[PDB]
Design a protein around this ligand. Structure first.
Ligand SMILES: Cc1cc(NCCc2ccc(O)cc2)c2nncn2n1
Ligand SMILES: [Zn+2]
Length: 206
């Protein structure tokens, strides 16, 4: 049921998505170990992801959350990086898209920083890097991220499975690295919708 529609670089929608992508790159404490060394991306394609069934599943859950949270879904747009992107955009997020060993427990993790999600496209910790060159910093091979609609509802704040009782998600608030943005976790696949598929390369800095 999934269809991918390409946005053209002349569309303001393409342009706003690229800017969210470029504007939220930061340096990582691993010096680039997981995701590579880069300050910006070369965006090759932005596709909108259309799947009526996944969308209806997402909106259904969004409404239940909103009614449980003073009519506020607390919907954000956040990045997600995974070797399972192809499964996600055809079948939706599910338990098999859970980072079993994440900091906030087995769930589905998202980030405000595109460069954080970029660390996961090739696996936990960057795995062994691109399949062609086994290079976590590969400037050649094409990568893909999702920019997703995520329902947070009442989110539990954590300064640094199930949500804590009373809550629909966990917000991981950056607590030492002053430049980091927030990271979020949800525990039900229906609370996210993989709205844009972004194909890109990291760029070698000058
Ligand atoms: C911790 C984390 C994991 C992310 N993705 C994990 C994808 C994944 C990779 C391998 C695996 O066995 C399960 C999930 C992620 N994306 N954007 C931000 N994050 N943050
Ligand atoms: Zn490569």
């Amino acid at each position: 049921g999934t269809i991918l529609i390409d946005l053209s670089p002349d569309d303001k929608e393409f342009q706003s998505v690229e800017e969210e992508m470029q504007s939220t790159v930061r340096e990582h404490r691993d010096g680039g170990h997981a995701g590579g060394i880069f300050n910006r991306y070369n965006i090759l394609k932005i596709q909108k992801v259309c799947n009526k069934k996944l969308w209806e599943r997402y909106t259904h859950r969004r409404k239940e959350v909103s009614e449980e949270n003073h009519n506020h879904a607390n919907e954000r747009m956040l990045f997600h990086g995974s070797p399972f992107v192809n499964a996600i955009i055809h079948k939706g997020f599910d338990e098999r898209h859970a980072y079993i060993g994440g900091m906030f427990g087995a769930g589905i993790y998202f980030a405000e920083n595109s460069s954080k999600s970029n660390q996961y496209v090739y696996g936990i910790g960057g795995g062994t890097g691109c399949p062609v060159h086994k290079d976590r910093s590969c400037y050649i091979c094409h990568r893909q991220l999702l920019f997703c609609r995520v329902t947070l509802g009442k989110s539990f704040l954590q300064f640094s499975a199930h949500s804590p009782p009373g809550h629909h998600s966990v917000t991981g608030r950056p607590s030492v690295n002053g430049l980091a943005l927030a990271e979020y976790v949800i525990y039900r696949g229906e609370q996210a919708y993989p709205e844009y598929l972004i194909t890109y390369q990291i760029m070698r800095p000058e």
